[PDB]
Every structure is written in C-alpha cells, then in structure tokens.
C-alpha cells in the first residue's frame, strides 16, 4: 500500500511593498486548512491518514513555482491543489505537470479576487492542454472567514477521493493466475490498457505454480496448521446438491478442505509476497508479484481437475481470516481483468471490499407475478436484478455490519468483532457442483441484507476508442422469504445472492430496469457498498474513461474545467470529445 501525497500550492500577488506581504497569512492559511481537512477525513486503505505537503513558501513568481515543483518530484505527489484570495500571474504561477490532476480553489472574496485568478488559471490550463478542476464556492465569504464553506469541501472531497485513486494504482500490477476463461473478455488481458490508462504493470503465473507449490510444500506450515483449525471452527460446510453418483466422501471432502486453505495461502502468498517463504528457504518465492489487484482464470482446465477457487477467491475478498481482521486482497473470478478493476476503482475511492457479481437475470413485475403470485412492491416495485457469482463473494457482502441500525460494508479497521461472527453465522459453504466443477472444492453461500445504498460498476473495452465506464446506483432489496426462495431455488442456490433496483431517471438507459440490464455491457459488475457514482465520475475524466452509462445528477457531476470548452449541453458527447483528444495519461 503506497501512501500517495497531495500537494498544495498556495499561490499569491508576487507584488511586494506591502500587498504580498499583507496576503502571506491568509493564503498560508487556505493551504493549511485544506492540508487539515484532507488528513483529518481520508485515510489510505491500510487505515492510516492520508498525507498532504505544502510548497516551500507562497508562489508569486516562477522560482518559487520552480521550488515547489521541486520539493513535489520527491515527495510522491500524486495530484496537486493550488489554493489562493487574490490575483496572482496564471502561466508563471501554475503547476505544469501533466501527468497527474490538478484543482484550483479560488476564495470567493470580494477585497479578495481569488476567483478572477481562478478563471484566468484555468483558461492557461485549457489553452496548455494540463487538465485542471476549479473549486469556487457560490457563497461570497469574509475577506476574514476561514471556515472551508460545504460546497467547496464537496468538490475538495470527492478531487482528493479520486485523484488518491490514480496515485494508489500507479506502479502496481494486475497479477493473472491463469489466462482466458472460457473465452470471457475481460479475461483476455489487456496490457495496453493497463499501462496507458492506469499507470500500471501486468504479471502473470500459470496455474501451475499453485500445484508446484502445494506439491513442494511452498507455503507456511505452521499457518496452514492455525487455518485448518480456525476454518474447522468458524466455516459451516453447505447442503451438498450433488448428483447421487458425484457426491464426495467425507474423507475426500476434508483433504478438499486442506487444499482450498493451501490455495487461499498461495494466491495471497502470490499477489503480495510473504518473509515467512524466505524463512523456509524459498527466497525467490517470498517477494510476490506487487499486485494490487489480481485473477484467477479457474475454468475450465484447473476446475475440471482440482477443487475449484470460490474459497480462494471468497476469502482474498472479505476482510479477515485466521490471521485477523484486515485489508481485503482485490480479486477476480475467472481472471476477469475488467472486473478485478472495476472492483478496484470503487475500492480505492472507499475503503470498502467489493462483491464480484454476474448480472444473472433481469426479473419483471409481470415474471415474478406468473413465478410466485405476489406483486413487487416499494423498491423493487419496477423489476430487479439477480445478482450473483459463480461460487465466491466478499463475506462482508452478507451486508452484516451495521450503522445506525442500516445494513453496510466498512473499511476494516471499523469492523466490530460481532460483525464478524455475524458475517460467519449467516454464511454456508456448500460443497462445488461437480457437473461444472468437478475438481470439487466449496462455493460461498448468503444473502446480501435489503436496503443496503450500493452502486454497480463496469468497465469495458471498446475496440479503437479503449475503456469505457458505466455506473448504476441503487439499493439492495429483501424479497418476501417464499418469492426468494422460490426465485433462488430456480436459479443457483448454491451461490450469493444480491437482489438489486437500479435508480431510475427516466433519462437514457434509466427509464426501466430493463434497460439497465439490457445495456450492460458484460455478464459481470463490480458492487460496492454507497452511492459513489460522482465519485467515479471524477475518476474516470482523472484518467480520460468515457462514461457511456451512469444514473448521477448532472449536477454532481465534477470533471476538469477544459471539458467545458468541449460542450455544456451535450455533456456525454463532450465527455467523448475530450477523452478522444487528450487521450490517457500514459501513451
Ligand atoms: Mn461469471
């Protein structure tokens, strides 16, 4: 986990005999203020606060620009702030870095012109090509007021999320353990993407390494000793739906078990290394392969010989084992690359675990009616969505964690122990079916509580144009017990369940859940606890993503300034336009 910095730049009149030095105090200020406000709400997903540094001095004229730019190159910044109350000289005073983001909050004073430089700035910005975002609040302030005023903190906010997003995928890489599964898309990775887009490198390990290593004994024994036990304890094995002829002894069950924790250990052992490995003599194996994100590919060769990698995959993705409650491993069913990053940008921007999910079916009021004789109502009054994987999903998706007595998923150092055993207590692992799964293994089973604030998330590659992002936010829903479980039975009730409705705006692919659905654009999205459309947004024009699909009030929507200047009434199409011309951060 890298701890990417912000970097503030207070800028100010380089006039002297009185006027600089008459705003050094107050522009000081707004620097220390958004510093304070950025490390006292964020923290990095290892828990600890985010970290800000400010320029050496004020910024007036261009050594001191120089200075600061300076003291940033290795300070690990990652996305710059320029704050200031008053004019200062535009071109000799911005930051020119291109290839992280940029925002500029001007005071909204009237003794004090912040937002005259502010426009001017930006129009450099825009006529320069170096994307930046300007931060100016409706609300004329006090030339003395200090207070950050909540519109501003909105956009300060939801910059920070995102740009700490790109700063936290830098340098990292997607680990593929396997290649294509079954023909899926997203499994056929792109680098090309990786590298331009996010800033990130590709590594790869066929699925071999998994047997060479169990066959060798690549991994810690005394670990495996404290997981058998823990997992004996704490994991309830499922009803076994098998066919009479392909059920498992319990013998062979329980070797099954064995393997699916060795797998669970190597798949972590992989993506970040581990100085036990070192310990036992397997120096080269300790270091890993510095994913932040990875996939298993599985099916159909691994999983037609070998228990399959739901416990594997259940388990990197909730936020504890027998090691303690921690930080979740980002991954992947069926080394779909796409999702594994969808999951990602969604985790970067709160902290949360992430539930893997294929879009399983769309069910109509008019389909549910015929199946079970009741009429939706509430939420799920216009349809809905099935929502569930092939076998795995984060535990912490149960939606057991509370606040306020509502369903939710949290960053694990907000975990209460009863969560935890909440989660446990209302999940089932019913033995793999053999007929698709036939090396066996055990999948996860819950339902995911009602009422829980969640968006789904996806992006895909379109040929020529590159990764473009959809975005639904919704609610999950609790269906009357006999409609889910006839609903369930009928579907794959060895599996998670989410039952999701989307929001619905009337606009777009929004007029229906229906259209929803129909305008997916793979068998897999990515679900995260809140409501984070805009905070994707923001991301996505941060990294020149299209978006193609999203149900966020165009009011929330925050993207740089120049992309203004491609449109403000046509604003999906200037959204493309400007994308298309500035093209990714690193081609
Ligand atoms: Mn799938």
Redesign the pocket.
Known sequence: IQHPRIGIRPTIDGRRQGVRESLEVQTMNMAKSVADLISSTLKYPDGEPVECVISPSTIGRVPEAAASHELFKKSNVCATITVTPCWCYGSETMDMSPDIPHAIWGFNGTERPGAVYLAAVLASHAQKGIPAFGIYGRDVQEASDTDIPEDVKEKLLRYARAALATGLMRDTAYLSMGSVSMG?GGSIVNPDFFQEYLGMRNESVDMTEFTRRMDRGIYDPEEFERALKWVKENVKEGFDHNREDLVLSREEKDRQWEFVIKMFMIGRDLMVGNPRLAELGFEEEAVGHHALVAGFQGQRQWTDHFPNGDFMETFLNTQFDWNGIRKPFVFA??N?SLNGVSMLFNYLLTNTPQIFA?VRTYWSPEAVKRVTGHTLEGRAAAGFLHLI??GSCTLDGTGQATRDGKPIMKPFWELEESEVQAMLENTDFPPANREYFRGGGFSTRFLTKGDMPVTMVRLNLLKGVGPVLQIAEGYTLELPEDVHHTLDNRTDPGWPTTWFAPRLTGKGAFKSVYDVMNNWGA??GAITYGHIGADLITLASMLRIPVNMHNVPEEDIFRPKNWSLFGTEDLESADYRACQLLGPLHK
């Open positions: 899926i069913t069926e779909d294929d994987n092939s068998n897999h």
